[PDB]
Amino acid sequence: GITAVALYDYQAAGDDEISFDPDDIITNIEMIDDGWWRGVCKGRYGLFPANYVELRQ
């Protein structure tokens, strides 16, 4: 599976996107859009602002 980590604290603009703390790491992060991502944060899926998040490996 995939897993990302927020480089900084960001707040999702729309309901389609979720927010997550920097140190707060999450899993199942799959890239749907070349500019946007998606993953499960604390048991919830959503969109990941590529500007404030990064997929680990």
Binding site: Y8, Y10, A13, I32, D33, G35, W36, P49, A50, N51, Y52
Partner: peptide, 19 residues
């Protein structure tokens, strides 16, 4: 269409456009 670019990245050395 689901095309949308992420917001700008925060910077400390950034300066305003209006002086």
């Amino acid at each position: 269409q689901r095309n949308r670019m992420p917001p700008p990245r925060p910077d400390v050395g950034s300066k305003p456009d209006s002086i």
